């Protein structure tokens with residue numbers, strides 16, 4: 285059972301801008317997704333300070349980076365607070381309408397795409413490198429769901445029957461054919477060291493063989 289939704293017009297506009305603007309500094313997508321993961325981990329940690337049972341779904345607070353050259357995917361896994369179905373539909377838990385408005389005003393006033401995270405819509409930088417993004421998520425208060433979009437104005441939401449995650453979010457980037465550098469260990473390490481040195485959670489880069 286798959287539900288198909290239209291993006292709000294302003295979010296479709298944001299994604300079109302990200303996909304169509306010539307902008308070479310694509311590597312910032314990883315900083316933005318890791319920052320979202322850190323924010324998610326902060327939220328479940330804060331909730332656990334007064335209610336330890338919030339961590340019954342998993343006590344470990346971490347971020348895993350999983351490249352897969354056979355599938356051409358880069359997956360960013362966190363064990364943060366996750367998102368409900370309602371969160372997924374409401375632009376992955378963002379205030380994306382007002383964030384997009386502020387972002388595009390900043391771009392016409394001299395900003396560049398790398399500042400996207402300052403406007404709370406950093407998730408959508410995934411489309412700098414991905415032709416399709418799948419988000420699997422599990423929040424303590426809801427069931428496990430899969431969101432997916434190849435842009436083009438629509439996204440789908442379905443109950444996920446895949447491997448149970450316990451709690452957290454998995455962002456699966458189906459990379460564009462010319463963006464496979466972001467599956468290479470030395471490239472991912474370089475980006476993490478450059479942009480994510482002060483993230484307060486362990487970031488484990490998985491290797492392949």
Ligand SMILES: OCc1ccc(Oc2ccccc2)nc1
Pocket residue numbers: 316317318320321323324325327362364365366367376377407453455
């Ligand atoms: O990288 C995009 C992304 C978006 C959301 C997300 O989970 C949450 C869920 C609730 C609050 C903060 C973060 N994790 C990754």
